[PDB]
Amino acid sequence: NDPAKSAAPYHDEFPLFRSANMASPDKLSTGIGFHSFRIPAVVRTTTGRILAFAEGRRHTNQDFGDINLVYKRTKTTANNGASPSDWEPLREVVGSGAGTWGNPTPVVDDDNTIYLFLSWNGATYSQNGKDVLPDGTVTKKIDSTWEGRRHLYLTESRDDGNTWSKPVDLTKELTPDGWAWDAVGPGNGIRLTTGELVIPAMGRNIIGRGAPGNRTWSVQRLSGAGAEGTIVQTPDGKLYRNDRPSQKGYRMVARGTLEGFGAFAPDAGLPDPACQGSVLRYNSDAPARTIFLNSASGTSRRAMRVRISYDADAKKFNYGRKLEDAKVSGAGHEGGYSSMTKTGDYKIGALVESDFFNDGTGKNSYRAIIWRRFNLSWILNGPNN
Ligand SMILES: O=C(O)[C@@]1(O)C[C@H](O)[C@@H](O)[C@H]([C@H](O)[C@H](O)CO)O1
Ligand SMILES: O=C(O)[C@@]1(O)C[C@H](O)[C@@H](O)[C@H]([C@H](O)[C@H](O)CO)O1
Ligand SMILES: O=N[O-]
Ligand code: NA
Numbered sequence: 367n368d369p370a371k372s373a374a375p376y377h378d379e380f381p382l383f384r385s386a387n388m389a390s391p392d393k394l395s396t397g398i399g400f401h402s403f404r405i406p407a408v409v410r411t412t413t414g415r416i417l418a419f420a421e422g423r424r425h426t427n428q429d430f431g432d433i434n435l436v437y438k439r440t441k442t443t444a445n446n447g448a449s450p451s452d453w454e455p456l457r458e459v460v461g462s463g464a465g466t467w468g469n470p471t472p473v474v475d476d477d478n479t480i481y482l483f484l485s486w487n488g489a490t491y492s493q494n495g496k497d498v499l500p501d502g503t504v505t506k507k508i509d510s511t512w513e514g515r516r517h518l519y520l521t522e523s524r525d526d527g528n529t530w531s532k533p534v535d536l537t538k539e540l541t542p543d544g545w546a547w548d549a550v551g552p553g554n555g556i557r558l559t560t561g562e563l564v565i566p567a568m569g570r571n572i573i574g575r576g577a578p579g580n581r582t583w584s585v586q587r588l589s590g591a592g593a594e595g596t597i598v599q600t601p602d603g604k605l606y607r608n609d610r611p612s613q614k615g616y617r618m619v620a621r622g623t624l625e626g627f628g629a630f631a632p633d634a635g636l637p638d639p640a641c642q643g644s645v646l647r648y649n650s651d652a653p654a655r656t657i658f659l660n661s662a663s664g665t666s667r668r669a670m671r672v673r674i675s676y677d678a679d680a681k682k683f684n685y686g687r688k689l690e691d692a693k694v695s696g697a698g699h700e701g702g703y704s705s706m707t708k709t710g711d712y713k714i715g716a717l718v719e720s721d722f723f724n725d726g727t728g729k730n731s732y733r734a735i736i737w738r739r740f741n742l743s744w745i746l747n748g749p750n751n
Contacts, residue, residue, distance in 0.1 A: 368653055368676075370742035376713065377744045380450055381697040382438065382737035383420050387722060388697070392456040394436070402427040402733035403436070405552050405642075406705045406717030407470035412478040413443040414710035417527040418717055418737065419459070419470035419482070425500045426729040430492035433468050434461030435484055439527045446711045447737065459521060459530045464489040467519075467533075471551030473563055479522050479579025483550045483565055483572070484533060486517040493547060509546050516548035517541075518567075522579070540572055540585055549593045553644050553705045558599050562624065566595035566607065573624065590630035592618055596645040601654035602678040606645070608633070614640045614664055621679060635682055637664045642703040646714070648674075648742075655742070656680045657714060659704045662688075668701035670718060672745055687748030689718065689738065697734045698722035713739045 383403035384392045393399040400422040407419040422436040438453050445452040459482065460467050469485035490499070491514050495507025508514055518541050519533035541548050548568050555565035555572075563574030563581060569591050574581035592609030600606045600621075607627065609618045616632035636658070643660030656675045663669035673686030689700060702719030709715045716738045725731040 368742070368746060371746040373741060373743040375741065375744040375747050377692045377738065377740040378448065379692055379694050379736060379738040381694065381720070381734050382418060382453065382717065383436075383456075383735035385722070385732040385734045387724070387732040388734065394456055394458055398424075398434075398461070400434075400436070401425055401730075403735045404719060404733050405468055405470065405703055406719065406735050407472050407551065407553055408705040408707045408715060408717045409472045409474050409480065409554060410707045410709060410715070411443075411474050411480060411526050412476075413526055414446070415443045415526050416440045416447045416707065416709065416715060417472065417480065419472060420717075420735055421468040421470070422456075422458075422461075423733070427731055427733045428497070428729050430466055430487070430497055430505060431499055432464040432489070433466040435459040435467040435470060437527070443526070444710065446709045446713070446739070447715060448739065460484070460533050469550050469552040471553060471555055471565055471567075473555030473557065473565060475557065475563065475581070476561075476578035478526065479524055480527055481520065481522045481555070481563070481574075482530070483555070483567075484519045484521065485548060485550055486519055487515075488513060510544050515546050518548060518550055524579070536583070540583055542569075542585070542587075547593070552594065552642060552703065553596055554707075556597055556599060556647070559603055564597050564605065566597040568593040568595070571597065571607075586624070588620070588627055590618070590620065592630075594642045596643060598645045598647050598656055598680070600656060600678060600680045601650060604679065606680050608636075608643065608645050608658070610642055611638060611640055614638070616664075617643060617660065636660065637662055639663050639665050639667055641667050644704045644706045644716070646706040646708065648708065648714075654678070657706060658683050659706055659716060661701050666701070668699055670701050670704070672714070672716070672740075674742070674745060685748070685751030687745045687750070691748060692738070692740070692744075694720070694736050697736055698732065700736055709739060713741050715739050
């Protein structure tokens with residue numbers, strides 16, 4: 367039995383990061399605009415304010431080149447981001463240089479310090495190499511040199527997201543030596559019942575211990591982990607990694623504690639097309655719930671489905687509800703990376719990528735990000751479960 371099913375279903379949805387092709391495209395106050403927005407992350411702070419982050423991809427939808435880390439906040443701590451007018455204009459966390467600032471992975475600490483882990487690479491490097499930049503420059507492949515590797519940066523805010531520190535490079539401390547490619551998140555980290563922070567990253571968790579907003583960091587290496595991971599604390603208090611697979615098929619799941627994890631294995635209940643997903647601890651009292659969101663397809667990113675598990679170890683999720691049951695118009699084809707938070711008014715708030723697909727899979731396809739709010743009742747009253 368879930369009493370939430372008896373509440374009135376609630377949903378609303380609208381574009382929050384508007385690509386350059388849309389009416390009223392999102393630009394910074396400096397006039398700097400963006401072809402595409404990708405790679406969402408969202409958190410609710412301890413005040414109730416919502417912070418939404420994304421990669422502002424300047425010139426194309428590509429993963430490399432000039433990409434800035436951008437964000438929006440709710441105007442007040444109490445408005446819950448319910449309508450477009452509730453959100454501030456686009457701001458920038460970091461945009462220095464013509465390199466890539468991305469993979470936003472925020473976590474809100476107990477003191478309300480908001481930590482934001484990020485990945486960086488140089489202006490003339492790309493994951494595969496030999497990619498053509500807008501000016502015709504051909505990229506070098508990301509490699510293990512200081513200049514050519516993926517870095518891990520940390521910034522934080524002490525004023526509810528209003529301002530951000532200059533990002534500090536933590537690569538030598540928190541990325542293993544000899545690495546070339548790297549990734550943190552993207553999506554979110556968590557705070558455990560026992561007080562530690564856990565931030566998911568490629569092949570590892572980053573663990574924060576000690577005083578809120580003055581944490582010491584260490585690395586928990588994980589055998590079999592993916593590049594793009596998610597982390598949740600399940601109702602049993604254990605840790606749960608749910609990672610993007612290297613090949614299309616299913617989410618890769620492992621369970622553990624701060625002392626170690628077991629093996630990663632595909633979750634046959636969670637089809638995935640090799641794309642990022644998101645996971646969220648909703649509540650701990652009966653009935654305890656974990657929420658999961660991804661594209662529920664072995665092939666397509668356009669099958670977004672939000673689900674609930676009542677299991678103490680999140681063994682099984684229900685069918686849930688397709689996001690297309692509450693479709694957004696005028697913002698392209700919804701589907702891709704996502705991020706979820708709980709809102710101050712007992713809703714789930716989700717950011718979800720969308721793709722106009724005007725250039726197909728090509729670099730000129732405009733990408734936007736949708737903001738959704740829905741309650742548990744909305745999920746539970748879905749026509750397929
Ligand atoms: O939309 C994707 O699939 C994407 O390209 C977007 C990300 O910007 C990129 O960092 C990531 C990466 O390429 C894979 O995780 C393989 O390492 O995937
Ligand atoms: O379901 C997919 O994957 C799709 O076919 C349709 C999506 O709307 C689009 O975002 C995506 C993307 O172009 C590729 O994943 C490579 O970037 O292509
Ligand atoms: O610091 N490894 O739990
Ligand atoms: Na930049």
